[PDB]
Amino acid sequence: EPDKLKKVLDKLRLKRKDISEAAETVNKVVERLLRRMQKRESEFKGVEQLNTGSYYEHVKISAPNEFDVMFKLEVPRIELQEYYETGAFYLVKFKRIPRGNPLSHFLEGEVLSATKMLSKFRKIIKEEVKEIKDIDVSVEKEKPGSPAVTLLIRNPEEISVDIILALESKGSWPISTKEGLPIQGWLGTKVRTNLRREPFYLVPKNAKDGNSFQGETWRLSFSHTEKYILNNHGIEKTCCESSGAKCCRKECLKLMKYLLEQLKKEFQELDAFCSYHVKTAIFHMWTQDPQDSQWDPRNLSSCFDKLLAFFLECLRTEKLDHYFIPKFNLFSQELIDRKSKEFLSKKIEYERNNGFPIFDKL
Amino acid sequence: PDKLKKVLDKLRLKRKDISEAAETVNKVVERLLRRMQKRESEFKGVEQLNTGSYYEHVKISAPNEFDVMFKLEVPRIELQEYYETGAFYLVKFKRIPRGNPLSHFLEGEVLSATKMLSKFRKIIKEEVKEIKDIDVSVEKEKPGSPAVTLLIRNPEEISVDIILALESKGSWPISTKEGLPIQGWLGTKVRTNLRREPFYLVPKNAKDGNSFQGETWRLSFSHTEKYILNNHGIEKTCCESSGAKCCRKECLKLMKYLLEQLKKEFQELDAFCSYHVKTAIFHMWTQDPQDSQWDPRNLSSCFDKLLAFFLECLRTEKLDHYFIPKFNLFSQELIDRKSKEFLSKKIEYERNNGFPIFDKL
Ligand SMILES: Nc1nc2c(ncn2[C@@H]2O[C@H](COP(=O)(O)O[C@@H]3[C@H](O)[C@@H](COP(=O)(O)OP(=O)(O)OP(=O)(O)O)O[C@H]3n3cnc4c(=O)[nH]c(N)nc43)[C@@H](O)[C@H]2O)c(=O)[nH]1
Ligand SMILES: Nc1nc2c(ncn2[C@@H]2O[C@H](COP(=O)(O)O[C@@H]3[C@H](O)[C@@H](COP(=O)(O)OP(=O)(O)OP(=O)(O)O)O[C@H]3n3cnc4c(=O)[nH]c(N)nc43)[C@@H](O)[C@H]2O)c(=O)[nH]1
Ligand SMILES: [Mn+2]
Ligand SMILES: [Mn+2]
Ligand SMILES: [Mn+2]
Ligand SMILES: [Mn+2]
Ligand SMILES: [Zn+2]
Ligand SMILES: [Zn+2]
């Protein structure tokens, strides 16, 4: 099957008219719901879209039926208090609450409450999707702890769009990330330095392990940095550019994400796995094999296979480090049953062992 | 499959380049629209005609230039065919209901194209002046042209033609009676319902013996053309996820790019345009209707068959409008012989020497 994976890729490659019309309507809903948030004298007044990539590039590495957009808000200087043992989850206080700043509305004691803030955010969003009648869009019901306000756009069929509130901090990145982003031998030290001068983001995802200061915790997000890595992924500056050579890095990612996606459809036993796991694993793969020659389109089968083997080893050692927070083990026993890891390993091996019958979709 | 496949490969732009130009153009358009929709304008109710999104770049045309059409539904129309051109018309109103803004641009019974295009131009110009979000400007007006051309420059320059388009829901003009000859290709039910849709009038003035006729309009079927381009096969699944690929759009994109580059080097080629190539491939898709005659493996023979057909069009000075068969885009009166022989010789040269114009690496 040296070219069977290309057949999968080509069948996946979607209607450029499906991309445009869907990206245009998701855009319109977002760009107007954004515009209508900045003119409402709420606390989110100064909100902006964070540049994390369009629906256009999204479909090339992920499933078209599910999208996400991040609304960033810059907040006065804040101090981060590490919430327990991940280096990813935080309680947030203001170093000093500027007078008349309406974000004080959301405090729960001294800490900025992700729940209070996300609840009003949800309220304003819900309140303007209701005036939207140019498009068929509804707000799906609340799943607790989730950072998203999920829109369901069904102009013809259904596309869920997560709207994610993001606090933006221009200060130095938190110390749990200090040896994260190990791109020095791949994208290099000047790149790493300039990415770590960018802001970082906090999304209202609560951690689930405490004495009722859980509803106030936030989680670090590096979506903007991840966009950069995904689009600037070669050691050569012209990798996958018009005047440079193609690599199969992104193709391997699309294939891995499509494989997880089809497995997750058949087996609710796979509920705990998610695209971020696969994306995290390929970041490590790209660090380990940083040479563009190690990702030759002609070697797609081998490259895909070494990503599968790497992922399988993460499952078996129950270790998959967050690429930006080496402390944070996404595959720890606290988070994913060992029986679920073993289940996914079984299914992946089976597909690996038998020429990927699940891609048998002609 | 020698280099055409690779020519197409490097021609493909990446979807952030697309995303960015598309969102830029669309946001300049979207709000050029959203404000014209305001009060006091004779143009309110203007909508955007779906003639296509940025995927114009997308394997059929050049990302350099783009065009959008702003459609305006008008009351019932009387069209008086200008001379017997078939494409050019005088637009009369049966009568106007009270409160219709379009009465401003009336001359007796004649909706003046020039006078309507003029303050269309005026309001657009007065509005691109009001956004500093993007660098956008309005190039000098060209006489007879139907466009107001936006010059967009975020980083690099994209010119967007905004073309006003009257929408009429009446029957298509008699000049189109034997146009759209798709019956052996997309079929008679398709032809029927396509001709049940509205048709459009853009302010392109006709060119006669004495001078530009300031108030004539020209028929446009850009909406129908977008349908055909995207629904181009005899099999309903052609180029769909559960059907087979063809190379029709690839041939169109190769041909447009050849004309583009040839025009880039020789000023003798200023008479020829994008719509000539499109019209040629429409007839070509009519002559060779079946999807097997456009298999992607036979790309080079398909391309060469289109080049041969276009050459035959050049030498014979015959390229009928696909919708208006008595309108000859390659007539004597529109393009002189010198221009056709020039183009023909360049095309034969590139064709026999394996397209040297195409060298990139
Ligand atoms: N993106 C991200 N995710 C991180 C990070 N550190 C830890 N995580 C955790 O990994 C998964 C990611 O879930 P995904 O499905 O891949 O992405 C989610 C999801 O689509 C919605 C809702 O978030 P969720 O946490 O509620 O998702 P569930 O799968 O239902 O898991 P559960 O614990 O609640 O039950 O939003 C996406 N999403 C979450 N966070 C982000 C984000 O930061 N940026 C973007 N663009 N999308 C996000 C999750 O458990 C996540 O918490 C990390 O650094 N980045
Ligand atoms: N698209 C179209 N064009 C038609 C039709 N019937 C007759 N024509 C004539 O063919 C050319 C089209 O030239 P293009 O460059 O391919 O498209 C034009 C052009 O880019 C601008 C300005 O119009 P223009 O005619 O003034 O441009 P020039 O290249 O300088 O030609 P010239 O004769 O004046 O010297 O707008 C485009 N454009 C014109 N008309 C349309 C239209 O109806 N729809 C769309 N999307 N774009 C249009 C022209 O001479 C054209 O009039 C026909 O049915 N369709
Ligand atoms: Mn959730
Ligand atoms: Mn979820
Ligand atoms: Mn012109
Ligand atoms: Mn022109
Ligand atoms: Zn690459
Ligand atoms: Zn096709």
From Swiss-Prot, chain A:
Positions contributing to Mg(2+) binding: E66, D68, D162
Cofactor descriptive note: Binds 1 Mg(2+) per subunit. Is also active with Mn(2+). Mn(2+)-activated enzyme forms an inverted pppGp(2'-5')A intermediate, suggesting a non-canonical but accelerated 2',3'-cGAMP cyclization without substrate flip-over. Mn(2+) ions are coordinated by triphosphate moiety of the inverted substrate, independent of the catalytic triad residues. Undergoes a liquid-like phase transition after binding to DNA, which is dependent on zinc.
Naturally occurring in which organism (per UniProt): Mus musculus
Effect recorded for S146A: Enhanced stimulation of interferon production
Domain of life: Eukaryota
Motif (Nuclear export signal): 9-14
Binding positions for GTP per the UniProt entry: T52, D162, R219, L220, S221, F222, S223, H224, T225, E226
Residues annotated as binding ATP: S54, E226, K257, S275, Y276, H277, V278, K279
Subunit structure: Monomer in the absence of DNA. Homodimer in presence of dsDNA: forms a 2:2 dimer with two enzymes binding to two DNA molecules. Interacts with nucleosomes; interaction is mainly mediated via histones H2A and H2B and inactivates the nucleotidyltransferase activity by blocking DNA-binding and subsequent activation. Interacts with PQBP1 (via WW domain). Interacts with TRIM14; this interaction recruits USP14, leading to deubiquitinate and stabilize CGAS and promote type I interferon production. Interacts with ZCCHC3; promoting sensing of dsDNA by CGAS.
Known outcome of mutating C274S: Gains susceptibility to mouse-specific RU.521
An annotated GO BP: paracrine signaling
Residue list for modification N6-acetyllysine: K227, K237, K257
Annotated positions of the N6-lactoyllysine modification: K11
Recorded domain comment: The N-terminal disordered part (1-146) binds unspecifically dsDNA and expand the binding and moving range of CGAS on dsDNA. The disordered and positively charged residues enhance CGAS-DNA phase separation by increasing the valencies of DNA-binding. The N-terminus is required to sense chromatin and its phosphorylation blocks its activation by chromatin DNA. When the N-terminal part (1-146) is missing the protein bound to dsDNA homodimerizes.
Modified residues (N6-methyllysine): K346
Glycyl lysine isopeptide (Lys-Gly) (interchain with G-Cter in SUMO) crosslink, residue number(s): K72, K190, K227, K237, K319
EC number: 2.7.7.86
Annotated site, Cleavage, chain positions: D162, I163
Effect of K227R: Strongly reduced sumoylation
Effect recorded for K126R: Impaired deubiquitination by USP29. Does not affect sumoylation
Entry protein name: Cyclic GMP-AMP synthase
